Design a protein around this ligand. Sequence first.
Ligand SMILES: [Mn+2]
Ligand SMILES: [Mn+2]
Ligand SMILES: [Mn+2]
Ligand SMILES: [Mn+2]
Ligand SMILES: [Mn+2]
Ligand SMILES: [Mn+2]
Ligand SMILES: [Mn+2]
Lengths: 258, 258, 258, 258, 258, 258, 258
Amino acid sequence: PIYWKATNPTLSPSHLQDLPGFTRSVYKRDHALITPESHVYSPLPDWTNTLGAYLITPATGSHFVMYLAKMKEMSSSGLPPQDIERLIFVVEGAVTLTNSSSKKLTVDSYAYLPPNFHHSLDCVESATLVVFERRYEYLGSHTTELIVGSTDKQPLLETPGEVFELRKLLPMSVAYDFNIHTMDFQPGEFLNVKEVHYNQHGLLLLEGQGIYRLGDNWYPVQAGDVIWMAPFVPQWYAALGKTRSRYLLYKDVNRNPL
Amino acid sequence: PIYWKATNPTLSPSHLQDLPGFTRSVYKRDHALITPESHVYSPLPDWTNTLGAYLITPATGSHFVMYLAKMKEMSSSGLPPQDIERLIFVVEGAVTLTNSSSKKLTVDSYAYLPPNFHHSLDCVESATLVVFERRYEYLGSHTTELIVGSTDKQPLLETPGEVFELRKLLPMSVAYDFNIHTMDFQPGEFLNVKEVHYNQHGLLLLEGQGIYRLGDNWYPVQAGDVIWMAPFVPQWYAALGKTRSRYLLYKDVNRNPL
Amino acid sequence: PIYWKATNPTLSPSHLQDLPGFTRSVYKRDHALITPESHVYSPLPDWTNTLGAYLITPATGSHFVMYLAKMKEMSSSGLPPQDIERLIFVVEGAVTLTNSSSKKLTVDSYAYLPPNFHHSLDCVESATLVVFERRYEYLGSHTTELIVGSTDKQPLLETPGEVFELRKLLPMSVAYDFNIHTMDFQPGEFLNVKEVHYNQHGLLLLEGQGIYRLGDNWYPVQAGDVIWMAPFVPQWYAALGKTRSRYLLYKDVNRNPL
Amino acid sequence: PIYWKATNPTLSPSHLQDLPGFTRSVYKRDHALITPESHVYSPLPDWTNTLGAYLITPATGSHFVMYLAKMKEMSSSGLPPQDIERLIFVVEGAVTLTNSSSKKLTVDSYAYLPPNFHHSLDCVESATLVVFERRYEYLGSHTTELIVGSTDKQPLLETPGEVFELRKLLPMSVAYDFNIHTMDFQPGEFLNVKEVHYNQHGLLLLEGQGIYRLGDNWYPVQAGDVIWMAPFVPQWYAALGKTRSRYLLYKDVNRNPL
Amino acid sequence: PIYWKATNPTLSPSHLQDLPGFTRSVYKRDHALITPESHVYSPLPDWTNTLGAYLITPATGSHFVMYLAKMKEMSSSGLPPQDIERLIFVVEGAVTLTNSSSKKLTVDSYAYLPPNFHHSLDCVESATLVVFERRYEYLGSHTTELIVGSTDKQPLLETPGEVFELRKLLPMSVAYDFNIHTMDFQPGEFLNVKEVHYNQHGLLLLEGQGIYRLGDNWYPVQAGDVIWMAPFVPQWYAALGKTRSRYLLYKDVNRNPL
Amino acid sequence: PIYWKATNPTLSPSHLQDLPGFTRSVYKRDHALITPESHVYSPLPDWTNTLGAYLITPATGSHFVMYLAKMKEMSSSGLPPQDIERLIFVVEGAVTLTNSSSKKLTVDSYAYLPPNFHHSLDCVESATLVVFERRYEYLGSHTTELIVGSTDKQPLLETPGEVFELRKLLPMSVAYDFNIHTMDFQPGEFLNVKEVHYNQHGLLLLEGQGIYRLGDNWYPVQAGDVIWMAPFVPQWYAALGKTRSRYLLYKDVNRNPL
Amino acid sequence: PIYWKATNPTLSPSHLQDLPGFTRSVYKRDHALITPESHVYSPLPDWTNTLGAYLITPATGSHFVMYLAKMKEMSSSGLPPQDIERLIFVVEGAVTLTNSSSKKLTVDSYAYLPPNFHHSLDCVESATLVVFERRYEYLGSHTTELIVGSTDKQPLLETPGEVFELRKLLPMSVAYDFNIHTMDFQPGEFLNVKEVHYNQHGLLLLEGQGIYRLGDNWYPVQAGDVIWMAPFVPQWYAALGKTRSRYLLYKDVNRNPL
Ligand SMILES: [Mn+2]
Ligand SMILES: [Mn+2]
Ligand SMILES: [Mn+2]
Ligand SMILES: [Mn+2]
Ligand SMILES: [Mn+2]
Ligand SMILES: [Mn+2]
Ligand SMILES: [Mn+2]
């Protein structure tokens, strides 16, 4: 299945049961490498029969949350707080979306919901969702709207001076205050620019493995690893191995950095 | 006696009189190990014949306060600020609580007082109080209520994939924005998950000894030690020795982290 | 041309194509060294056919933003939000100011813009500007007005206790919350006071090279480099090579550090 | 099977096939943590069909070698240089030792061959051997001699001030310049003395897991891991889990340190 | 030309002429990264019209030297001291080797001279040689002999557990106490085994670029770079970019490590 | 009792019985701080009924050995290997020495023994001696001779630029390659010279407490502590408390540093 | 007064008289910066009324010594051991050299003495000498001769790709296994090559001031400072201020580094 290793990591939590205290996770001043055996699942408030693990919250200094959601048999989502926009990405399984016709989202499907937009995600079997939420930044008479889609149905964008394959999930229109990029590196390929920008990131490695650099820290990574990149931290990546690398990325945009 | 070493640490301050500047205490970006020889006791404003030593305050980035109150003869407590909730746990001594009847609190006894709830703690001989205070986060029309009890009465809670015995002092209801856990470990037992969560902690080791890991730091701990765990700091623990480990722990709950 | 080595640094990005992930940039808690291989250019909103890269933003804990704007053939600028004073400085090219008259702004020609002071920049061929923005701290009734000039036209001010050549593009009258200094160093010359002050800095080395100190970190620098100095961060410089050193410097002034 | 995890580690090399460059191994000035995914097996000189991995050699600053020997079907050992004493301990399999009769060795069986003592190890199927060799420090006329045994047959020794169960495979008389110990720790138990001695070590954890402290470094460990301890390195261990800990240890003795 | 970048590194020393003191070179306790801007060339004693730069000498704790020799018009080699075996490798130009016979050596050509083997390297126009010298370690009554060849004529050896392409320039027989390896990696390929071995290394990256891990340090590397690996330093490499990586590697062999 | 705190230190091993893995001991590149909880006692070879604890040996790079010998009932010294010179100092108890009119030495007594000078130390009750030993560096004809004495019956020497009070147990004459110093410091006094010399030290604090500086490390110290100072390590000491600091110091002298 | 500050540093020990333990001295693994407050002066053996302080000895990993001899009222210089070569530099004062005729060495005068060569220095008043002593390495049948002279009498030398003015005090002739250079930099100039080589230095900053880079370390240096440079340490210098930088330097040459 697609994204299988993102749910079944080559180095899983159980392979460490005889290494007391060991972990690959790190939380530093400007970034964080959050790995599978550190995930903290607990009932998701307001949700019905769902465990979740918060990987990133503004406690870190971000303006967004990023959490994993384990939905099981007959379990439903619950409305997010007032003025909070939400974005979900099916990483495994299938869930149904409803408010104009019930759309069924399987793997690789995603859905954006404008702040205060009444909806419900219901599941009847399994489903592992990767969700992003943020207190929307109203700007002028500008507003967002319901977006539903599939990665593959998104066109390959131009990447001046880069070789990775880029696909954006939400519209690039000024309304949206963040977008979800899908980036792919073939084995050996890497980022030419050593980005240093006020933007901030939260990412999930869906396929492959490689080396990710943050500040003066170099980290080996595998499918399933999660990373938080705080504004202005030097970032870089290289894809390694026989298979390609794909990571889901959150990026804030269309707003004055003041 | 119950919690005797918590009040009489094996390695005491006087023991260090011949080691200028020496301390086991460490205050870092996302945590802190606060030890006895560093406690700063000063009279608690609005209290009677009660010496207090604050160990954690929002100055650290937390949203709660943690302090020890050494109540001597004919001592009494003072009401907390407006909208501030309070919780006291008796480590040593006896103290009566009034408001609906009148409860006598001894070692292992505790009491949660809702925000703006009138009450008074009065000590005849002496009492040692470990208390947490916080600005209550009102969630709709929910409100808390007086809670009284003692650890030895709270049922053992099972936690999946873990081996430590757990007890929760307060109700798990949505109205409470924090709970106090009691965690026990037999010598040799440890946390299977190396937690990284949005939740923040404040902890006190009542009995036992062991190794506490915070981020990339490892600290030997003995009863009486206090720890501050900021959000997302990697945390782990292992119980060592002949006797068991037991620690009181604050944990924020039921509120959207966004 | 003057400042040419800023637009074209000796050690330029392409010279690093065969050093995967290699970078001279550093982002620490109290300072930052942003180099050319890390600039992230994205289309500046409200501007016309122009790429821009933010180098400093409040996310760093500053009260100001500093960015590079690469104006191309037939381009114009956008107005900043409300109460955002703006200063621009031409490091290369030419661009006409407009709105009260119309100045042909070229290399070394800067233009201040009071808050909400409507104005516009337009370029027919090509221009590169280093612009600073920040929410003006309204002091009493005092207010600002348009200012336009050139680096070589400003006076050489005395520098008590120091040897570098000092200039200030903007007035010192308390109406201005920030000032932009010009500093010249002859090979072998260095700052005499290991400054430690509340003021914050953002700087671009316009000409030359030398060693820059920040806290306990020492960085070799060349023209085109950019530095971020947070308050209270120990700073120090020394110019080297056969040619003098010159850097554009932002500095906050005339406002209670309270 | 005895010591099954020592040869089939819970966190094995394969589990790390998707984490490029990752390793739990460390080599520092005064110690080393050598783990499986780092063993370098090469044909052993003078041996027949036997791959070997040197874990420790005098390049480290030690006076002994410690290597692993994978003896496959129909194999035999080779004689060691002149004046080199040898000790072999069987971790997996079986091998016959001939030369005073021939003995069939098995897991837990060990043989010590004095310097220049003709012998031959002949394996028919498989056998894993941990061996130590050293340029014997002759002392006067005393001379060591053939010693063939089995851990279990060895008696437990009194270790004043410690709770671990100790055994020594070789005699304690002056001729021997080193001894091999078998140290057992029950969960929760740990060393009381934070050892700092001139004696150097080489160890292999056969069963269990725990934390090993070396200087200011703390390492989680599991059966299979190997430690190099240089003279005078602060050392400490703690056993953890459900199962007990057992490590093989080399120790130089009976020779004036000056 | 073959190995061009190796002769003219992408990031050449001149490119850094405006960065006083800057360098990619590192010299640590158990390894080193020697780069072009650090090459110290000097008249090589006993040679004629040849500049030499020693990169590694036993002062590092190695048992061999490694240097680049810049032979100019009408130049000739100098004999190595008694018992000093020598191996040369041509990375640029051409030189002749006389005295048994005479071979014309171009790029990729090499010659191993046994200890005390009289010879001579005469170059007409110019050539660049990376040469290795070591005091030969006599074992019993074995002796090495002249070996001359070409990397390409050498056969691809089996690399069990790895995917890279391996070639060995000298015989693997007992007489040789070291061999020089040629290792090729296609982009995205890396070492599966994170080596920790007593063998020490001398390395020159002839083609490609990538990331090298030495202990807990990561280094971006390019053609022309040189690395020193002391015994037991954890090592790892991953090739990145469009073209493959190739590196010359010295390795000590066939001698007992005690 | 004299030097009582040296034998029974304020902070003692048993005070840390609940602090798993904790120690004040440090073993670095240029120095060491060996504290009581790290002392490793084992039967001293040839000695009778005595347990020794080597604190310093050549393995550290020193040219001497320093150890504490604890002699019990009917105990006696043993002879040091050939050509070795021995110095003893009784810190607790009583020992008699013979071989010419025997002698009895009590706390604060001592005796130097020329290389190969036959002698015997006979104790009844018990005594704890701190002893040094080295391979005497013969300076041609020069020879050493037996010595007996007591710190207090030894003259106070000059100490220009230094406020402390000194005493040298051995004669400064050329035939002696080392002496033992006694340095007293009064609360608040400290070494004015921030030493960096070829000499090497072994220092046991007998009285007082304070702060010793070694390189960039600052170590709080208490009577009983022991320090290893390698050549050229920046050293320093300041005394604190109500009492005075007093330590026994080894210093190599009278030999060419070549 | 030529070389005044070298004898009376701008930052003096007495200035640090109220900074307990402070020192600018650094002694690391591969290098060292020794400053004025750390010099340990003690009576030089075999000398007459001369206080000497050893700055660098083979204990550092050097093959030479470098000390300062303070010659007072009627003082003589003791003879070096057998086979030890010796060079002397008069930093200040006056001393007379006699074996073949008398020689009056004054500030800037130097004399090199071959091994086993007989000579004597005699001082009436004061004289500060910086001397280097080394066991001579006999190559073939070459022998060195006695050399005497002054810096400015020495010719300027070609400094390819460099700008500092060079001068050598000894013959580059093969017989000599070391030389002493005089290097001058103007304020602002610096080394282009960030040197990494087998040669080992021992320098004295005679005039000027600037920044010295050793490894990843940056040290502000002043006249009077001393530096030990072990083989292969990355090194670099920059002169600064109004006067010029001038430093004396040791460097081993003409010997195979095997
Ligand atoms: Mn980015
Ligand atoms: Mn927790
Ligand atoms: Mn400033
Ligand atoms: Mn031990
Ligand atoms: Mn290797
Ligand atoms: Mn000293
Ligand atoms: Mn040099």
